[PDB]
Amino acid sequence: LKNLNYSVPEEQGAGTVIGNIGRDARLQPGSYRVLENSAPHLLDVDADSGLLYTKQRIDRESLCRHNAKCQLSLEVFANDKEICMIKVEIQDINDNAPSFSSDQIEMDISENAAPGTRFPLTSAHDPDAGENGLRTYLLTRDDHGLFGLDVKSRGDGTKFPELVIQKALDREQQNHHTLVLTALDGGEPPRSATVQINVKVIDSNDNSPVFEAPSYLVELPENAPLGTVVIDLNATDADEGPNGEVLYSFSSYVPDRVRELFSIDPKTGLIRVKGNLDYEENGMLEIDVQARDLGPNPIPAHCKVTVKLIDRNDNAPSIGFVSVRQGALSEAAPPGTVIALVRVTDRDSGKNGQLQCRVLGGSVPFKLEENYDNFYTVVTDRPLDRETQDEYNVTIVARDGGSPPLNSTKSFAIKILDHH
Amino acid sequence: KNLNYSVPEEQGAGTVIGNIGRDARLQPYRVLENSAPHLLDVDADSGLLYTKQRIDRESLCRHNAKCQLSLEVFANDKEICMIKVEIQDINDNAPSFSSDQIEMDISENAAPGTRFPLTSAHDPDAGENGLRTYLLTRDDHGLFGLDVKSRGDGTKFPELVIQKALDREQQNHHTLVLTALDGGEPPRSATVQINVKVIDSNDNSPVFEAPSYLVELPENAPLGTVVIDLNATDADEGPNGEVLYSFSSYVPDRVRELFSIDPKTGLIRVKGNLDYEENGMLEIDVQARDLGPNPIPAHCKVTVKLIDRNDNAPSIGFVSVRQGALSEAAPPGTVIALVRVTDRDSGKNGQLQCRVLGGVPFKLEENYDNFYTVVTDRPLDRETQDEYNVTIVARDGGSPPLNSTKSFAIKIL
Ligand SMILES: *[C@@H]1O[C@H](CO[C@@H]2O[C@@H](C)[C@@H](O)[C@@H](O)[C@@H]2O)[C@@H](O[C@@H]2O[C@H](CO)[C@@H](O[C@@H]3O[C@H](CO[C@H]4O[C@H](CO)[C@@H](O)[C@H](O)[C@@H]4O)[C@@H](O)[C@H](O)[C@@H]3O)[C@H](O)[C@H]2NC(C)=O)[C@H](O)[C@H]1NC(C)=O
Ligand SMILES: *[C@@H]1O[C@H](CO[C@@H]2O[C@@H](C)[C@@H](O)[C@@H](O)[C@@H]2O)[C@@H](O[C@@H]2O[C@H](CO)[C@@H](O)[C@H](O)[C@H]2NC(C)=O)[C@H](O)[C@H]1NC(C)=O
Ligand SMILES: *[C@@H]1O[C@H](CO[C@@H]2O[C@@H](C)[C@@H](O)[C@@H](O)[C@@H]2O)[C@@H](O[C@@H]2O[C@H](CO)[C@@H](O)[C@H](O)[C@H]2NC(C)=O)[C@H](O)[C@H]1NC(C)=O
Ligand SMILES: *[C@@H]1O[C@H](CO)[C@@H](O[C@@H]2O[C@H](CO)[C@@H](O)[C@H](O)[C@H]2NC(C)=O)[C@H](O)[C@H]1NC(C)=O
Ligand SMILES: *[C@@H]1O[C@H](CO)[C@@H](O)[C@H](O)[C@H]1NC(C)=O
Ligand SMILES: *[C@@H]1O[C@H](CO)[C@@H](O)[C@H](O)[C@H]1NC(C)=O
Ligand SMILES: *[C@H]1O[C@H](CO)[C@@H](O)[C@H](O)[C@@H]1O
Ligand SMILES: *[C@H]1O[C@H](CO)[C@@H](O)[C@H](O)[C@@H]1O
Ligand SMILES: *[C@H]1O[C@H](CO)[C@@H](O)[C@H](O)[C@@H]1O
Ligand SMILES: *[C@H]1O[C@H](CO)[C@@H](O)[C@H](O)[C@@H]1O
Ligand SMILES: [Ca+2]
Ligand SMILES: [Ca+2]
Ligand SMILES: [Ca+2]
Ligand SMILES: [Ca+2]
Ligand SMILES: [Ca+2]
Ligand SMILES: [Ca+2]
Ligand SMILES: [Ca+2]
Ligand SMILES: [Ca+2]
Ligand SMILES: [Ca+2]
Ligand SMILES: [Ca+2]
Ligand SMILES: [Ca+2]
Ligand SMILES: [Ca+2]
Ligand SMILES: [Ca+2]
Ligand SMILES: [Ca+2]
Ligand SMILES: [Ca+2]
Ligand SMILES: [Ca+2]
Ligand SMILES: [Ca+2]
Ligand SMILES: [Ca+2]
Ligand SMILES: [Ca+2]
Ligand SMILES: [Ca+2]
User: Fold this and answer.
1) In principle, which of A411, B256, B276, B391 could form an S-S bond with B407, CB 3.0–4.6 Å?
2) List of domains in chain A
3) Chain B residues touching residue A157 (CB < 8 angstroms)
4) What are the two backbone dihedrals, phi and then psi, of residue A234, each rounded to the nearest 5 degrees?
5) Residue A241: strand, helix, or coil
6) A219 Cβ inside 6 Å of ligand 1
7) Where's the motif Cell attachment site (chain B)?
8) Quick check: B349 and B401 in contact, CB under 8 A?
């Protein structure tokens, strides 16, 4: 009766001699019969030599998986009535490295990810047992610690990693990242395996449109021809796709009239004339544009284009009699006798509305006397005794200071009570 | 032969555990060295092993799955025996919480999915008689849920889950019951009340009673006259629900000169003289904001419509007065001067009627809008005057009316 305890590395060569029962147990000298055995396909003893040998190669991972202890039993009988209990352990060697399901994974991370957020990653697997199994994961974060790593265990004592966002992300600062996750096992020959993580930084609508300048001032000549270009506004959004697709439109509080007068093309941003711009109607107008991106929760942006009109001499002067005497002027009417009161006007402004008026001949004896703003008195010029005329067809002329100028005329008749 | 017994805990005092004599095949028993002198003893002359007191497996072996007591007795003629008896667990304990009520402070702003710690329970019993799981009683339409998670040992702990959003303004407090259940065929349970105070987050804007108002006031109204008392309400708590009034960013300065709004009441009152002729009606754009963080503004608009009073007498102005001396035989109707009358008021208050002092020989003849010609009335002779002090009178149609006069002198040559 004798126990024997062996222990042998895995991946032994087929036909490797494990032991010598006869010599190790101190039996005689002969016959070595096998009573029973855990694995007949793996271990056998030569009947006439007492040598215990491997029948095939032995992969401890295929036999005992992760078990810390891995044993094979064998019960032999020796020459002439002596029994031996052989038990041999198969030791683990670090002949396997941790392995990932791929060499590269790809993920979709929005730049809106809050710092601290954590993201799944594929775990690695080491079939080796004990100290030769999975030890930990480690990251190679190239972007000065933008990404971190969290390592957590599960019930069986195996670990899995997860990505951490240690500081915020910004697509518009870096669109893509690539960082390498490695898995390390224990054992004196440390086995490792790596995987590249290729992360797409998704766009979040975090940029407002921006007009080249908040305010503009544009001069246009009044009565400008339809379709005249007013201005091409340009707004830019640094986001992607629709988040960075600008749409222009008239603000809510631009008056209807202005909407009648101008047309803005929604995609170009071109403001062009749509109606006749009368200076006498309105000196200058305000066009309040707004631009918005076509993303969700869109960000509006306001701009202000002041159109300042230029007055052109497009109104001739008008003449209007407030009161006129009749046809009965006395021969001896003193110089300065009032004959009529008149107004002259010009809707234009500046030189275009600057008037100068005169009588057709005064050769007839009448003077025009300007008393008030746009108010003239036509009176008698001379005594009506030497150059006496039976009837007069007085005609007033008004002339503005335009380029070119404009003039209008208007007549009335008067008689003298001359020969009686 | 050793003797191996196994007996439930909390046995009756003096319960017979075993019979040494029969089990070990011996003869009729002194105790040499036993594990527990107070728990088990053997009757000297019968060989019977009995309990001396109760056995609480929890007090002896705590959570240990196996719980054993040794005992060494002998019998006549050097008959040595090894007795060993295991104590089985029974579910004589329920899970227990450190209290019967917890209270929590959860803000209504808590994101759905958020989870909150809760106190765990403890069962002293062993194995299947220990803590099994927790269960919640959420009475308010499944407002809150429960997550149960294991620890390194295999012990479980609960935490509250917010499965959908909360709203203080809809329900200020909640109370829900968390119970812990153990295994064992008599299933033991123990409960704890969670009293959760729902904190306010500034999630309500102020609200004016109406977006727009229209108020009439008489021009030149006396200082301090009340224009309107605005009222805005915020349904939030504390500063989050504290209304503050102010004039909007885009109301012209002049209006700011004309009106005063009290920041806390919301009372808009007159601060300057309201001249109708300056501006017929004005717009006062008020805003109310709560005193919480990221405050929510709200806009209201009060249009002040003025009423015109006859506060402008009529003004007279000579456009032309010719010379200071007319012709002796000037025909009736000779123009002597052109004059204009005006009144800054509107309506009847600005409706004028004018006349000359006499008919002296001068008429007033209105030719155009607010334009009159003073002419000679009749033929100039048979009179004791050389120069005339002509005086014009204008009279408006106010209540009461107003009148102004203005004179000029002319001579006869
Ligand atoms: C909005 O963005 C446009 C385009 O973006 C530019 O692209 C190039 C130039 C880059 O280098 C950047 O600098 C810019 O962002 C800016 O440029 C306008 O482009 C339009 C589109 O082509 C131009 O319109 C052209 O006008 C030509 C006629 O030129 C006239 O002006 C000269 C100067 O005196 C004058 O001598 C001539 O006789 C004409 O009167 C015409 O031949 C062509 O077909 C086309 O119509 C436009 O001219 C450019 N800007 C301006 C102000 O003219 C814009 O700068 C930007 N908007 C604004 C308001 O700045
Ligand atoms: C803003 O509120 C004031 C006063 O508030 C009132 O408070 C209570 C006394 C009760 O009357 C509540 O209904 C009110 O909110 C208003 O001033 C009063 O208005 C009521 C009209 O129902 C009138 O009978 C009173 O004479 C007013 N003055 C008082 C009570 O001193 C005011 O009208 C409110 N503003 C607006 C725009 O509605
Ligand atoms: C021209 O006459 C007016 C009016 O004076 C008199 O008014 C009545 C009493 C009547 O008797 C008329 O015949 C008179 O002409 C003078 O203007 C006002 O005169 C009063 C004194 O009577 C004086 O208190 C006022 O201040 C004067 N002005 C006004 C606006 O009332 C005026 O002075 C006379 N002379 C000239 C050059 O105009
Ligand atoms: C308008 O005319 C009336 C009279 O025609 C003037 O009335 C007088 O006003 C004084 C005060 O200035 C009173 O003391 C008198 O009793 C009034 N007299 C009469 C007869 O009513 C009044 O002054 C004129 N208005 C202006 C601005 O001159
Ligand atoms: C008066 O003169 C104007 C301008 O020459 C002329 O048009 C008009 O016919 C004349 N009047 C008469 C009655 O001929
Ligand atoms: C005035 O207008 C008339 C229009 O018939 C024109 O013939 C004349 O040349 C003009 N005169 C001046 C000075 O502009
Ligand atoms: C892990 O580390 C080893 C070095 O021990 C490398 O050989 C391997 O490629 C992996 O990077
Ligand atoms: C980690 O490193 C290995 C080198 O052994 C690569 O093959 C792998 O793609 C990852 O970069
Ligand atoms: C836990 O469950 C028991 C029944 O198993 C109840 O009786 C007890 O009140 C508690 O709710
Ligand atoms: C659970 O039951 C206990 C009583 O045992 C209470 O503390 C609680 O109110 C809940 O009903
Ligand atoms: Ca192997
Ligand atoms: Ca390994
Ligand atoms: Ca191995
Ligand atoms: Ca960004
Ligand atoms: Ca972005
Ligand atoms: Ca954008
Ligand atoms: Ca453009
Ligand atoms: Ca015009
Ligand atoms: Ca013009
Ligand atoms: Ca003109
Ligand atoms: Ca007990
Ligand atoms: Ca229990
Ligand atoms: Ca128990
Ligand atoms: Ca709320
Ligand atoms: Ca709230
Ligand atoms: Ca109020
Ligand atoms: Ca609020
Ligand atoms: Ca006034
Ligand atoms: Ca008035
Ligand atoms: Ca008046």
Assistant:
1) B391
2) 1-95 (no CATH), 96-204 (2.60.40.60), 205-313 (2.60.40.60), 314-420 (2.60.40.60)
3) none
4) -135, 120
5) helix
6) no
7) 151-153
8) no
How far, CA to CA in Å, does A302 sit from each of A132, A237, A242, A285, B136? 66, 13, 19, 16, 53
Q: Which two tokens stand for residue A319?
A: 């003449």
Distance of residue B368 Cα from the nearest chain A Cα, in angstroms:
6
Of B322, B329, B368, the CB nearest to A322: B368
Amino acid residing at B147: D
CA of B229 to the centre of ligand 21 (A): 75
Q: Of ligand 1's atoms, which has the minimum distance to the CA of residue A234?
A: 1
Polymer length in residues for chain B: 413
The resolution in Å comes to: 3.7
Radius of gyration of chain A (CA): 55
Alpha carbon B158 to chain centroid distance? 32
Minimal-distance CA residue to ligand 8 atom 6:
A194
In A, residues 327-356, which contact B (CB 8 Å cutoff)? Answer: 328, 330, 333-334, 336-338, 341
Strand ranges inside B138-280, DSSP E: 144-150, 156-162, 173-182, 189-199, 207-208, 212-218, 226-229, 232-233, 243-247, 259-261, 267-270
| Ligand 3 mutation pick, B389, B392, B405, B406, max ligand atoms within 8 A of CB | B389
Interface test with B, best of A251, A337, A339, A417 (most B CBs within 10 A): A337
Q: What is the DSSP letter of B202?
A: S
Which chain A residues touch B329 with a CB distance below 8 Å?
330
Cβ count within 10 A of residue B41: 19
DSSP A201-216: EE--S----EES-SEE
CA A381 to chain centre: 80
Cα R_g (chain B), whole angstroms: 54
Q: Which helix (H) or strand (E) holds B4?
A: strand B3-8
Contacts of B229 (CB under 8 A, 6+ apart): B265, B266, B267, B268
Amino acid at A292: R
